[PDB]
Amino acid sequence: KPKLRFIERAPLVPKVRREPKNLSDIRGPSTEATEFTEGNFAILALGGGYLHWGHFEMMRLTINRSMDPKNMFAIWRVPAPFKPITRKSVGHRMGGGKGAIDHYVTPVKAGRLVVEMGGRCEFEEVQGFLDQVAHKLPFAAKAVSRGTLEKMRKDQEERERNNQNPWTFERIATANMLGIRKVLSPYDLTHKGKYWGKFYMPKRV
Amino acid sequence: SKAVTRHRRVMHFQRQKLMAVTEYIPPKPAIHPSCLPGLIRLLRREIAAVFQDNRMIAVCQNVALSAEDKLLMRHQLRKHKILMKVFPNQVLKPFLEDSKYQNLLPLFVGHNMLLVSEEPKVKEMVRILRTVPFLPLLGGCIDDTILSRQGFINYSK
């Protein structure tokens, strides 16, 4: 079935217990689903954010529009909206508990692949509508091949080995050089200063 | 403000100074590096076979025609056993020095088409070319002897 299957608004089984918005599901490098698995092309996230239902319809709709099913198949990597984001009633005063569940959402961290592509297709064919899709996303994303992915990871190794700067963020943060963990997160010892909030700095070694 | 925000949160000032001091510095070399120092053999075998084939050769500037007009020229020279050949001079300039044609090295440039032959209908080809007030006869070479257009009048006559 070489198309994007329908992604529902909310699963059949509901989630009756409300959840705290643990925004560290946006922060930092993703662990789940960073590499390809029987894919050749993807929409890599250069930053974290939340996917709604409407985003999933933008991707399913505007990909399955411009797609050759006899040449190209595609796979969701990001699951269905499962995080219940609540909103209080409009123009009502604070307190009185936590608001009712409004709509569900997926968290996507940086370095996540969202939609894998595959088949008898070159990269330059699929750059177009995956760049349109990659621009309609809430976070900064990019259409990435396999060779382009290993290309930019080898680039990041080149940056980490070429720099004539004696002072990196890793040497300063982990050694607590300038007494500087007073200003840093404890996550900044593992993010190593490439992540600020939900954003991602590719240019920063 | 939370730790994750929608806008890029303002850093603490020593956070920002750390980020500026630990920027990436690229290496600078002392000298800039930019300021330092099948079909081809098909044409070689094919046209090299055409070299040994022809006793007489001629050539023109056959770019100045239409498609059906080149079809008319193709049929009127199909009436003879002469052949016409549109091929790149890019490979033909090493062709001439291979075939020991030193008087033919200053001949083959720009738009040209070969008229390789063993039997001269080239007078009657001139009779076809006299009705069209263009497309001149460029000099040929029968049996390692060069033909000027005056030599085409003499030999063709």
């Binding site: 064919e125 750059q127 177009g128 | -």
Partner: peptide
């Protein structure tokens, strides 16, 4: 031969056609 490189040219033309879809 001749039809070998003609075939290679026709596959290159197909390739350029499949690349020039979105333009």
């Amino acid at each position: 031969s001749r039809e070998y490189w003609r075939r290679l040219r026709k596959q290159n033309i197909w390739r350029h056609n499949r690349l020039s879809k979105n333009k």
